[PDB]
Amino acid sequence: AGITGTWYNQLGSTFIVTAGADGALTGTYESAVGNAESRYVLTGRYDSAPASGTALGWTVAWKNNYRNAHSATTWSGQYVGGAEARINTQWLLTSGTTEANAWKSTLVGHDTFTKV
Amino acid sequence: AGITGTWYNQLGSTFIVTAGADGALTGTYESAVGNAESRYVLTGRYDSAPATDGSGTALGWTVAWKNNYRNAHSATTWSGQYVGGAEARINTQWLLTSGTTEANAWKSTLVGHDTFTKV
Amino acid sequence: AGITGTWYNQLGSTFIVTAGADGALTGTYESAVGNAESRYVLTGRYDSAPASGTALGWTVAWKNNYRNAHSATTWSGQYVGGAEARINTQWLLTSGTTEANAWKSTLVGHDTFTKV
Amino acid sequence: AGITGTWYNQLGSTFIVTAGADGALTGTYESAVGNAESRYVLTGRYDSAPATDGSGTALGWTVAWKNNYRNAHSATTWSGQYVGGAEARINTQWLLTSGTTEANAWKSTLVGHDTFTKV
Ligand SMILES: O=C(O)c1ccccc1/N=N/c1ccc(O)cc1
Ligand SMILES: O=C(O)c1ccccc1/N=N/c1ccc(O)cc1
Ligand SMILES: O=C(O)c1ccccc1/N=N/c1ccc(O)cc1
Ligand SMILES: O=C(O)c1ccccc1/N=N/c1ccc(O)cc1
User: What Cα–Cα distance (Å) separates residue C17 from each residue in B27, B85, C37, D86?
Assistant: First the structure.
């Protein structure tokens, strides 16, 4: 509804998503940073009967037919409607590692998405 | 195969998942704590072609806390890695965000960690 | 040096700090949000021989002579100098809880500080 | 008294601290992993008058990874709570931020969790 569309973040990445009546999120993600190229599949869920913003989250595993970074990012946040819609999030990016390096496997950040 | 199955965290929550050959995660989650009752749908992704150096397999999934019985107006995302072996595990870090007004946006997200096992 | 001074964040809070030659950080914090009133003591450390931004962190326990919220926040980030100095951070706020509620003890966020 | 002492995390790092009556934490930290060698100074704060309902005691501390021997140009902050008893513990979540250029600021901070015990 308000969620379905094309969005961009401060890094220049692109998120295209469709919100299903059943609370599913499906689309593709195109990243401006890291070891990535071309599009990647995304899947997520959202509150389909919100009351405040609308809670949602989605994941991307950084593997496609061209590259594999052996990592995955999860974005957790809320959708805020109005004139200028926005998705405020915090993310976790975890890399596959050996046991010895597991302590440094996860990065944390925050991204804000603007609807086109 | 490795990931596909029924898992449990430290709180006693149950995670039932199927890992597709293609990278998809699909299943149901039942929580032991919080404003929840019954099963909830989950969706996620994982690295279907991990490295061959003994590294873990990266993955992540989301659950929106709404079902036929209740709605907490929130969602959690888990990000981590699957570590195979005799006693397999999924080590994660999670973020739970609630829908809030602007005045409360500063305290909308909780952070934690969960360890899943087959027992 | 560049760090010593008065700073403000997006919430309207105030951070007054002095950076010691030995890498110590000392000052007071005045919060615009939560269960807080008047000033609170802060203590931290910073890289006294940086190369990029300057790594630093500080803590505040939300107890003073007037109120006690039974909680503490830790800010971890980097100092970026220039015309307009800034401290970019991510924080963790943990509340004292019973065993049963420990899973919901910690909040995570991000704050940007501007130097006055 | 409860907090004051020598503690160890899961990685084998050593945390030696003194808790002042007033809310101060002061001590030294020795890391088992990462770009570190020897002891590092730490500083923090804690709730000197916790609640009487069986709740934990909130606390936090920072370490900047620079000493007489090396400098990693980074700092970690731990935030958590002390839980007294026969087998006392300090449960935490931590953030490690490295000094980076603007181009790398997106990947400057790592997140994790540590459990400290007296053994
Ligand atoms: O692009 C973002 O918006 C983005 C935002 C948050 C976290 C990660 C991100 N991207 N992370 C990668 C990682 C490995 C790659 O191979 C490609 C992208
Ligand atoms: O249940 C876990 O395993 C679980 C694990 C990690 C983070 C959160 C959790 N659960 N958080 C809730 C929130 C709202 C509810 O209505 C039910 C559960
Ligand atoms: O004010 C900030 O900048 C601030 C920024 C991040 C996290 C917490 C903050 N403040 N958190 C409190 C908590 C309890 C209180 O009693 C008073 C303030
Ligand atoms: O040592 C721990 O217990 C530890 C625990 C939690 C997070 C980080 C840790 N250590 N991170 C480093 C980083 C740079 C160094 O030079 C040495 C250690």
Answer: 50, 50, 19, 39
Q: Closest ligand 3 atom, CA of C11? A: 3
- Residue at token pair 């919220």: C69
The Cα–Cα gap between C99 and C91 comes to 23
Q: Which fold has domain C1-116?
A: Lipocalin (2.40.128)
Nearest to A56 among B59, B75, B83 (CB): B75
Q: Residues of D numbered 68-107 whose beta carbons fall under 8 angstroms of chain A's beta carbons: which are they?
A: 95-96, 106-107
Alpha carbons C103 and A93: distance in angstroms, whole number: 21
Domains of chain D, by residue range, sit at: 1-119
Asked if the Cβ–Cβ distance from B47 to A71 is below 8 Å, we say yes
| Calpha distance D24→B68 (Å, rounded) | 50
With contact defined as beta carbons under 8 Å apart, do B115 and B10 qualify? yes
What's the topology of domain B1-119?
Lipocalin (2.40.128)
User: Residue D56's closest chain C neighbor by CA?
Assistant: C96
Distance from CA of A88 to the nearest CA of C (A): 11
From CA B52, how far away is CA B54, in angstroms rounded? 6
How is residue A78 written in tokens? 């809320």
Q: Resolution limit in angstroms?
A: 1.8
